[PDB]
Design a protein around this nucleic acid. Structure first.
Lengths: 38, 208, 59, 173, 142
RNA sequence: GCUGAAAGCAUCUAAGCACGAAACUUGCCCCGAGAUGAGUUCUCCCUGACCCUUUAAGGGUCCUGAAGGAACGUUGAAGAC
RNA sequence: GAUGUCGGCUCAUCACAUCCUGGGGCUGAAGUAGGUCCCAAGGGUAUGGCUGUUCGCCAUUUAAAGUGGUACGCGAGCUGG
RNA sequence: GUGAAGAGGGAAACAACCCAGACCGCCAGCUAAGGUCCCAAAGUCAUGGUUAAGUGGGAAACGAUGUGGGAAGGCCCAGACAGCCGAGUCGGCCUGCGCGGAAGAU
């Protein structure tokens, strides 16, 4: 997982979610696209 | 479950038929007599009180005599208590003997340790000694520094220093039961236990 | 001390200190806090009468 | 909203009882009870249930949608039921069922046993299949996930416990 | 004449009983402190005690707003180096329910011998049964 | 991770439910009611006459001296005292 | 009209930007071994040759030989190169 | 301008900041700066709105379907957007309050 202060959509299969006060990116095609804001 | 109260007799060895020596401690465990049963409605917890030994009649005060006479037993040299588990019951006046430990493997033993008086840091806390030569000035077995400086400017609570050593309560755990003899009132355990010759011991089944 | 005692006395009759004093001002009474506290402790019927006059003025 | 604005029909032979915020549904396949959030109103007219928001609450419609979905699932479960299928891939991997315990050999040095909860039934047609039958969607899903978690599928060959209709990707070293 | 002053040898006091089910902690504690000190009598005197005795029932059922059931932290220190310790509101309610109201009220009283004496007139119970019926307390709705 | 809407799809979360570490609370050992919020249980001992005054948790005269403790002596694998 | 100072010895205590042991995500991760990031402060974290040396180089060990604050901790505690 | 050579009230404690210049006595009244749930004197005041972070009660470039208000655009029962019939949907601009970035030694 990538811990960054700038979280973006990298391809067309990514989605942005808000879980427990944290913004995350989840991808259903590439495991490398998983991001977490922190 | 419950335990018993005994006296320390000494130490010896047992030889085995295959060529081994086992160092054992000999404990004399006479019969223990129930003096009071404490329950949950009147006291708040479940326990029994027991006595053992003998004591001369001219040294027994009237309150103690009345306490013994209510139960109906003769006087001993003390009173001890043991907490009860769920499903254990005893009755006033009953006697308990060493054969309770017939099928037990390991025990825990509690006693009072030998006294040493005032002791230093080398003996009490294993501090290291400074040099004996090379120019030392009156500081060989002394402790050294005990703090830092203006910050914090005090000595922390719990610092290791000199004082009284020994003469306190000690438990030892998980000792093998080498032998139980009922016709003689003897329990032989393997190893060593705290105290001196002629002291009171408490023996319980192992908790671990 | 006087002000605290007056507040306690008035809240038992059903008003607060600030409103009580405003009502006395609008009714043109000129008794001071020392006398008011003395009366509140030693004579209660008169204090009820004063509270009633203040309430009438405010109404 | 758009989901809560469709009533749920109760097929013949299903009994519904409403008491305050507690709802009970009974039928041929069994019994199911629930307690709803304190923001919804449920009304039963002749053959359908309808859900709506109460007054004074700021999130009535979302709660209504959730409740509608839950009751629809209960209605289907109390009559027809639910099924799950599991598959095993590998060499030396197998499963068996006795009573309410599933014994799995999955390449470990010790046996693995799993004890089913109340209300779920299991069976094995072949040594390398499991079928679960039940009436509660959440519990059936939880049991399936639990069984999966023992030895998850891997990305170099695919060995492990997987779902029936799951696609597992692979890559090369 | 001089201003009136109360005398501890002749002061009246009364017994009250209160229930704390579903009530806000601070908004109950204020009233408790006020009536313990005696700010509700015209005989109020700063250097004398003029308050009442109060019994509190159902202390394991007070209420807090927001996320305070899990996020309010109580701290203390043991006197030994490194001995800082903490607990949460849930843990306090699970172990020692009365300590909660007791701390809340204690923080709201004067500091000194007289405040310590005032604190002694507070009885807090975790259940719904007291054993002080020989004093005949009156029901107080706060 | 399961079920699930706001957002007819999807979603571990907003309503509900399950796992998860030598860190946290316990379980093991030692101290501990001056815990002035000074706690509980069992046993033992004391059952006489009068005066005064400013009248009360008052002062005094004769008879009586329990349970127990302390002091002294011979001492201890207890101890600077 | 005075707050003794470099290294060494004896004795310590705190933070986490974690050296070892514990729990996880990604990998250009087949296995054994690795690379990078997240959580985690309970315990444990070398003996010698040279030099006044802290450092440093060297020889042989260890699961590992952590980086910093405390008057560059500590001379009414020692030494005096 | 103040302190030095100036006391009194407020800012928790705080020469130089805000209010204000002490001849002596009073158990009288009105106000300034600042305040009115308890420590601690005085509104648990009245009306209309916002925040869910204990933000209020520490801090940036940058990132995000958090949530209020305003003015215009494209498509829409000549059946639109998402999925396999029936009421709306899509993308920008201006503005109010919040979230992340955010690690230290008794």
């Amino acid at each position: 997982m990538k811990v960054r202060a700038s979280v973006k959509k990298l391809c067309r299969n990514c989605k942005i979610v808000k879980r427990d006060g944290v913004i995350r990116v989840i991808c259903s095609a590439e495991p490398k696209h998983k991001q977490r804001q922190g | 479950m419950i335990g018993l109260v005994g006296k320390k007799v000494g130490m010896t060895r047992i030889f085995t038929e295959d060529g081994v020596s086992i160092p054992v401690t000999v404990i004399e465990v006479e019969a223990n007599r129930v003096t009071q049963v404490k329950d949950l409605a009147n006291d708040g917890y479940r326990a029994i009180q027991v006595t053992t030994g003998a004591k001369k009649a001219n040294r027994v005060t009237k309150p103690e005599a009345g306490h013994f006479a209510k139960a109906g037993v003769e006087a001993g040299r003390g009173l001890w208590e043991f907490r009860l588990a769920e499903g254990e019951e005893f009755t006033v006046g009953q006697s308990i003997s060493v054969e309770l430990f017939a099928d037990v493997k390991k025990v825990d033993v509690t006693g009072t340790s030998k006294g040493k008086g005032f002791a230093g840091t080398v003996k009490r806390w294993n501090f290291r000694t400074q040099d004996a030569t090379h120019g030392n000035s009156l500081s060989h077995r002394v402790p050294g520094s005990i703090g830092q400086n203006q910050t914090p400017g005090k000595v922390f609570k719990g610092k290791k220093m000199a004082g009284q050593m020994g003469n306190e309560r000690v438990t030892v755990q998980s000792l093998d039961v080498v032998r139980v003899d009922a016709e003689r009132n003897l329990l032989l355990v393997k190893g060593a236990v705290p105290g001196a010759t002629g002291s009171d011991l408490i023996v319980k089944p192992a908790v671990k | 001390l006087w002000i605290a005692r007056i507040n306690a006395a008035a809240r038992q009759n059903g008003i607060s200190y600030s409103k009580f004093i405003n009502g006395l001002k609008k009714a043109s009474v000129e008794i001071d806090r020392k006398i008011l506290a003395d009366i509140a402790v030693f004579d209660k019927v008169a204090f009820t009468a004063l509270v009633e006059k203040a309430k009438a003025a405010l109404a | 909203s758009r989901v809560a604005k469709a009533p749920v029909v109760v097929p013949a032979g299903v009994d519904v009882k409403i008491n305050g915020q507690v709802i009970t549904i009974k039928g041929k396949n069994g019994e199911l009870t629930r307690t709803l959030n304190d923001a919804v109103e449920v009304k039963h007219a002749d053959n359908t249930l309808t859900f709506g928001p109460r007054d004074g609450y700021a999130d009535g419609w979302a709660q209504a949608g959730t409740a509608r979905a839950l009751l629809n699932s209960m209605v289907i479960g109390v009559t027809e039921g639910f099924t799950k299928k599991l598959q095993l891939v590998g060499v030396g991997y197998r499963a068996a069922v006795k009573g309410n315990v599933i014994n799995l050999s999955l390449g470990f040095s010790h046996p693995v046993d799993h004890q089913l909860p109340a209300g779920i039934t299991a069976e094995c047609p072949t040594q390398t299949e499991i079928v679960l039958k039940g009436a509660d969607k959440q519990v059936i899903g939880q049991v399936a996930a639990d069984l999966r978690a023992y030895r998850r599928p891997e990305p170099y060959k695919g060995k492990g416990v997987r779902y029936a209709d799951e696609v597992v990707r692979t890559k090369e070293a | 004449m001089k201003t009136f002053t109360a005398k501890p040898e002749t002061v009246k006091r009364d017994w009250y009983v209160v229930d704390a089910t579903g009530k806000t902690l601070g908004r109950l504690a204020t009233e408790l402190a006020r009536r313990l000190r005696g700010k509700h009598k015209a005989e109020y005197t700063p250097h004398v005690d003029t308050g009442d005795y109060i019994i509190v029932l159902n202390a394991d059922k007070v209420a807090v707003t927001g996320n305070k059931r899990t996020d309010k932290v109580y701290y203390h220190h043991t006197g030994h180096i490194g001995g800082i310790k903490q607990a949460t509101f849930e843990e306090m309610i699970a172990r020692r329910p009365e300590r909660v109201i007791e701390i809340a009220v204690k923080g709201m009283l004067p500091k000194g011998p007289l405040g310590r004496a005032m604190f002694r007139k507070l009885k807090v119970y975790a259940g719904n049964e007291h054993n002080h019926a020989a004093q005949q307390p009156q029901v107080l709705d706060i």
